[PDB]
């Protein structure tokens, strides 16, 4: 009975640990989704840029928006965080104790 | 073992563990019977039942 009790307590706690893992994964994915939207916009502008009908002023405006988007990507990468972990700033490996 | 824990949280967990261990040593030393302590050592005792 005592060994069963130990097992039960451990497994309950481990279930909650798994919940933590789910949460952090979701946070990371949301950030990635915003990044994806920005990249889509940048590809659209890139397509617009190639038309030889334009002059340097128009290209400068296009570059302005391109730079703003890239700056926003940098900011999102820099500022997103979960309980201190900076999920996109650095390569990292996280273990979750589900047993 | 959650890699999600931030180091302050780990310190909190360590606090709780330390207090548990303090209570364990309290139980070990301070329990008594008739005035004699029981568990403050490995001990060996014969009762005369005949």
């Amino acid at each position: 009975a005592n060994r069963f009790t130990a097992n039960i307590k451990g497994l309950t706690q481990a279930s909650r640990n798994a919940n933590d893992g789910i949460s952090i994964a979701q946070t990371t994915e949301g950030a990635l989704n915003e990044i994806n939207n920005n990249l889509q916009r940048v590809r659209e502008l890139a397509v617009q840029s190639a038309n030889s009908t334009n002059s340097q002023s128009d290209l400068d405006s296009i570059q302005a928006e391109i730079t703003q988007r890239l700056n926003e990507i940098d900011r999102v990468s820099g500022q997103t965080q979960f309980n201190g972990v900076k999920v996109l700033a650095q390569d990292n490996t996280l273990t979750i104790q589900v047993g | 073992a959650n890699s999600t824990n931030s180091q302050s949280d780990l310190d909190s967990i360590q606090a709780e563990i330390t207090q548990r261990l303090n209570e364990i040593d309290r139980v070990s030393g301070q329990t008594q019977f008739n005035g004699v302590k029981v568990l403050a050592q490995d001990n060996t005792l014969t009762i005369q039942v005949g």
């Binding site: 965080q81 201190g84 972990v85 900076k86 | 931030s6 180091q7």
Partner: protein, 149 residues
Amino acid sequence: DNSTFKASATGLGGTDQKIDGDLKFDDTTGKYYAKVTVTGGTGKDGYYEVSVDKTNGEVTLAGGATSPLTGGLPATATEDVKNVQVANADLTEAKAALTAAGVTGTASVVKMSYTDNNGKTIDGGLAVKVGDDYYSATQNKDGSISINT
């Protein structure tokens, strides 16, 4: 101590010389000050700026020149004391106590900061640091320091 002043009094001259009052310390430039009265002399009675060693406190008048300090006393030294004053950086007694603890190393004193494996930084207290190795310290009434015990 005044005995070293009385020798400087022979530099001033006059029938007799004496220092009046306690000695005023300079908490911002590290100086002591004194007043002097002279018997039967002229232009030797004055306010003077003096220097002292901490082993004995023997007082010597650098201002011994025959003229009072401008305005009597500078505002930098308003606090009056009868005893050796020491700077916080000196940490004489804390360092002596450490040496009594068998510390075989010149001691530096610092302020702390920690970081976690995500780069988040926090601040800490005061420490006594011996090369690579660290001791913790606490601050007394006036900036004089203690080592946590």
